[PDB]
């Protein structure tokens, strides 16, 4: 009737210098992901994650319909990556779009290993979607 459910997402990325021929253009390997915290299963409320890569990549609309929600790639530059997390929700909101700063380690700096923790607050979710948030390890507030 009246209640808020909070769930947690973790977006992150790893990047390092690629050990390859001088004549291979891509300097870096990187990996971007969405996950839950330890012993939460976001798959209960996440229908899919869509990573929107730079237009220069082949098939830059990358869909993960189940875990792991991640893209592994090679490249030569950082970019801003739209990341859409779609919900198993019959009403609004149906999804959330993050603007992810995919930056590389440049000038012989250590590997990048970044995490961005997002808190989602669902006000007054339906019965069915409430159960999914709770199954995923969501918590109620009051
Ligand atoms: N602003 C800006 C900006 C412009 C371009 C890039 C970039 O690295 N492009 C790019 C373009 C094409 C690429 N194929 C691969 C390798 N992959 C292709 C098939 C899947 C597995 C290997 N890595 C690629 C990287 C990044 C930032």
From Swiss-Prot:
Cellular compartments annotated: Nucleus
Site label Acylated histone binding, positions: 101
Region Acylated histone binding: start-end pairs: 54-56, 76-78
Domain of life: Eukaryota
Function: Chromatin reader component of the super elongation complex (SEC), a complex required to increase the catalytic rate of RNA polymerase II transcription by suppressing transient pausing by the polymerase at multiple sites along the DNA. Specifically recognizes and binds acetylated and crotonylated histones, with a preference for histones that are crotonylated. Has a slightly higher affinity for binding histone H3 crotonylated at 'Lys-27' (H3K27cr) than 'Lys-20' (H3K9cr20). Acts as a key chromatin reader in acute myeloid leukemia by recognizing and binding to acetylated histones via its YEATS domain, thereby regulating oncogenic gene transcription.
Domain notes: The YEATS domain specifically recognizes and binds acylated histones, with a preference for histones that are crotonylated.
Subunit (UniProt): Component of the super elongation complex (SEC), at least composed of EAF1, EAF2, CDK9, MLLT3/AF9, AFF (AFF1 or AFF4), the P-TEFb complex and ELL (ELL, ELL2 or ELL3). Interacts with ALKBH4. Component of a SWI/SNF-like EBAFb complex, at least composed of SMARCA4/BRG1/BAF190A, SMARCB1/BAF47/SNF5, ACTL6A/BAF53A, SMARCE1/BAF57, SMARCD1/BAF60A, SMARCD2/BAF60B, SMARCC1/BAF155, SMARCC2/BAF170, ARID1B/BAF250B, MLLT1/ENL and actin.
Protein name: Protein ENL
UniProt organism field: Homo sapiens (Human)
Recorded name of the encoding gene: MLLT1
Span within the parent record: 3 to 144 of 559
């Amino acid at each position: 009737n009246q209640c808020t459910v909070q769930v947690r997402l973790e977006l992150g990325h790893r990047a390092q210098l690629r050990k390859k021929p001088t004549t291979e253009g891509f300097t870096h390997d990187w990996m971007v992901f969405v996950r839950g915290p330890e012993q939460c299963d976001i798959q209960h409320f996440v229908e899919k994650v869509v990573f929107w890569l730079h237009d220069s990549f082949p098939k830059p609309r990358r869909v993960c319909k189940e875990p792991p929600y991640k893209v592994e790639e090679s490249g030569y530059a950082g970019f801003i990556m739209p990341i859409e997390v779609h919900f198993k929700n019959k009403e609004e909101p149906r999804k959330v779009c993050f603007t992810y700063d995919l930056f590389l380690n440049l000038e012989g700096n250590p590997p990048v290993n970044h995490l961005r923790c997002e808190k989602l607050t669902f006000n007054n979710p339906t019965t069915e979607f409430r159960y999914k948030l709770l199954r995923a390890g969501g918590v109620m507030v009051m």
